Design a protein around this nucleic acid. Structure first.
Ligand SMILES: [Zn+2]
Lengths: 55, 69, 96, 120, 100, 68, 112
RNA sequence: AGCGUGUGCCUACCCUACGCCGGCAGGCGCGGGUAACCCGUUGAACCCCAUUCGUGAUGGGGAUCGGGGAUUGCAAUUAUUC
RNA sequence: AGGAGUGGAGCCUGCGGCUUAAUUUGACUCAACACGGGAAACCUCACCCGGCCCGGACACGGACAGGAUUGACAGAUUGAU
């Protein structure tokens, strides 16, 4: 069955369980504190969330 | 004389399953029959010991320069 | 795409009761979050709304991972003829 | 000609004992594969290939059943057979010796050909 | 009577202003009030690259948040806490009220 | 387009005409006589039949094979 | 997500910024735009549509929120609104230079 | 000693005190923490004190490699790791 | 003026070259070479040997509820019930 073979790889762990919430690319994720974002979109919305530059 | 079995260097031999602490001529004989066993069994490890390349899965492009001339 | 009758029409009164609905854009979604009483996936919902888009009844907007589908007045008329209702029932979008 | 054995016992002696003591005779890595739940999740292929190896011809060389799997636990129940496993391009036909056990069929089929070198 | 009121925000000036409002109301109602206990703040340090590609000098950023918390323990019944929570509401600082 | 490797065609189901002739036998009396064994599963109805093989029958979307 | 969603939606309305507030059972959001007659749609239709969208997409109890609408003063003192106005002037198709000195004159007469 | 970190929308991978088993990594229960509350007074390494070693490719250096035992995972062979 | 060094030894990583069904690609003095947040066993994958699903919407014209097709079981079959 194609319906039962469509889910044959378990997506429990690895890189494919998580993805970017903006650009949907599984490269350079930030799993810190539940961003689940890539670095570039985090840069684009860093000050909108509230991350500023002081140090 | 009450030495623990796990301390011995060779455990669970393929010919008898008996734990035995082996010595110089014994290690040389066991190494050469193991090499001959891998050559006769024709495995990936046997081909690597025949070719002299890496066995434990490591790179050769950068390190291991002094393999041959 | 061959849809069962019940799932498609259930999408139709969910669109008719409240004139706007959202859905996450992902192929591998075995169950819709809001409509979880019956086993309905999401890809049939996206394909049915894409068909409605191409025949010109709904609009599209996409921000991160969620599709936003916006009905029109002539879309409300199409829902009224497809659900076979008298022209007196108006959804809460036009109501105060 | 000499007597072959694995851990001091014979092939038929391995044949008439169950998996619960077969793992006790095996090594540490082979135990955790066989003792991890039920062989139904991904090892339904393993069970069906073991059924297919239990299917037998009359008295000749047994059939070749070429496979697409490399993580085969080489059991004594399939000693003396013919199989060619997949390594990406073709099927390397190998005859199953009694010393195959304790290894994998993917270990006995090389993927890369022997690399030769010439003028840079 | 053992109610603990926790005030937390990011901007310390608005939190100090609403703490001044709380202590002014407590002194107006003429009852004992605990001073605002100041915990050490928690920092949000994330260091990401500046080049989106792999070209150029390796330069980084320093993004940071400061969250300041000041809790007031009040020896009053619940309805005064509910009234003072209902008055003077701003989105900069949130109010955490939970009896033990 | 035409590639090097051959391709097996999809299962083009051949159209069979007058299938409603081949479900019940009609005689002079008005009582019908079914020619196929009925599926007793609750997923399908009482009007469905079983497949006509040469050894044993076969149900519909239930996909249940009953022996003798 | 709310700011990007309103930026994408009200690009053809002149949207400046969203004023989110938190309040017990009165969690209200204010959308500051230069146009008031176009944000409400037709007899308060699009504001209720956006209310329902955020209501059952963000995850909230139903009926406890309301979407306000107001106009921003000093239209020439907002960088987003003037960039959107120049995007209005450029989307129809004009010379870039006349629009550039026009929006510069608008900025200078606004008091910047 | 000090920066920190510690139970997730999709989601299932959190930090460990305490008492047994075992040289060892590790195995089952009794718990705490949505956090200056519990790990935690984070008994860190370097360093200090006392024997053994004695200029020797040597208790320096630990590459290469054989056997055995455990955890993660559907799967470790082209040694994942210990 | 000096301190620690690198370059020589072993190991890890990257690049070029050779090789490969494929060993995917960009970056070549500062201002590319533990860089692409690139510590990849499977997804990652963009590379290859191979096989199924359509995820070809919507219109125009052929076929209609008497059927336009998907869903499958003793057995040859890749690779898999
Ligand atoms: Zn049936």
């Amino acid at each position: 069955g194609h319906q039962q073979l469509y889910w044959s790889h378990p997506r429990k762990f690895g890189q494919g369980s998580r993805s970017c919430r903006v650009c949907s690319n599984r490269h350079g994720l930030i799993r810190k504190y539940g961003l689940n974002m890539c670095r570039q979109c985090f840069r684009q919305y860093a000050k909108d969330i509230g991350f500023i530059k002081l140090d | 004389y009450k030495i623990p079995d796990w301390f011995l260097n060779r455990q669970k031999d393929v010919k008898d399953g008996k734990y035995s602490q082996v010595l110089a001529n014994g290690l040389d004989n066991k190494l050469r029959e193991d090499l001959e066993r891998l050559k006769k069994i024709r495995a990936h490890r046997g081909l690597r010991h025949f070719w002299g390349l890496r066995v434990r899965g490591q790179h050769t492009k950068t390190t291991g320069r002094r393999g041959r001339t | 795409m061959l849809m069962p009758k019940k799932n498609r029409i259930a999408i139709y009164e969910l669109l008719f009761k409240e004139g706007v609905m959202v859905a996450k854009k992902d192929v591998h979604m075995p169950k819709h979050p809001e409509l979880a009483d019956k086993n309905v996936p999401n890809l049939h919902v996206m394909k049915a709304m894409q068909s409605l888009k191409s025949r010109g009844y709904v609009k599209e907007q996409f921000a991160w991972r969620h599709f936003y589908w916006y009905l029109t007045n002539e879309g409300i008329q199409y829902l009224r003829d497809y659900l076979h209702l008298p022209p007196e029932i108006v959804p809460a979008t036009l109501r105060r | 000609f000499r007597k072959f054995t694995y851990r001091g016992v014979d092939l038929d002696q391995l044949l008439d004992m169950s998996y619960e003591q077969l793992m006790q005779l095996y090594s540490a890595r082979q135990r955790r594969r066989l003792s991890r739940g039920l062989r139904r999740k991904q090892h339904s292929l393993l069970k069906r290939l073991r059924k297919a190896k239990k299917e037998a011809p009359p008295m000749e060389k047994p059939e070749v059943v070429k496979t697409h799997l490399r993580d085969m636990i080489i059991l004594p129940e399939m000693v003396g057979s013919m199989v060619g496993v997949y390594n990406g391009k073709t099927f390397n036909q190998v005859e199953i010796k009694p010393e195959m056990i304790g290894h994998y069929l993917g270990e006995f089929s090389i993927t890369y050909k022997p690399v030769k070198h010439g003028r840079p | 009577h053992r109610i603990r009121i926790t005030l937390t925000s990011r901007n310390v000036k608005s939190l100090e202003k609403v703490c001044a409002d709380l202590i002014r109301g407590a002194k107006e109602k003429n009852l004992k009030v605990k001073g605002p206990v100041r915990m050490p703040t928690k920092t949000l340090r994330i260091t990401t690259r500046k080049t989106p590609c792999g070209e150029g000098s390796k330069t980084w950023d320093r993004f940071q948040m400061r969250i300041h918390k000041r809790l007031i323990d009040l020896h009053s019944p619940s309805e005064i806490v509910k009234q003072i929570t209902s008055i003077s509401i701003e989105p900069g600082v949130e109010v955490e009220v939970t009896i033990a | 387009k035409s590639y090097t490797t051959p391709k097996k065609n999809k299962h083009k189901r051949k159209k069979v005409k007058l299938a409603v002739l081949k479900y019940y036998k009609v005689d002079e009396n008005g009582k019908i006589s079914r020619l196929r064994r009925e599926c007793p599963s609750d997923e399908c109805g009482a009007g469905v039949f079983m497949a006509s093989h040469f050894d044993r029958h076969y149900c519909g979307k239930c996909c249940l094979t009953y022996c003798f | 997500e709310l700011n990007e969603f309103l930026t994408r939606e009200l690009a053809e309305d002149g949207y400046s910024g969203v004023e989110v507030r938190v309040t017990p059972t009165r969690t209200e959001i204010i959308i500051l735009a230069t146009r008031t007659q176009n944000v409400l749609g037709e007899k308060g239709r699009r504001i209720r549509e956006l209310t329902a969208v955020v209501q059952k997409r963000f995850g909230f109890p139903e009926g406890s929120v309301e979407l306000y609408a107001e106009k921003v003063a000093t239209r020439g003192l907002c960088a987003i609104a003037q960039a959107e106005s120049l995007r209005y002037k450029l989307l129809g198709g004009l010379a870039v230079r006349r629009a550039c000195y026009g929006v510069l004159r608008f900025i200078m007469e606004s008091g910047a």
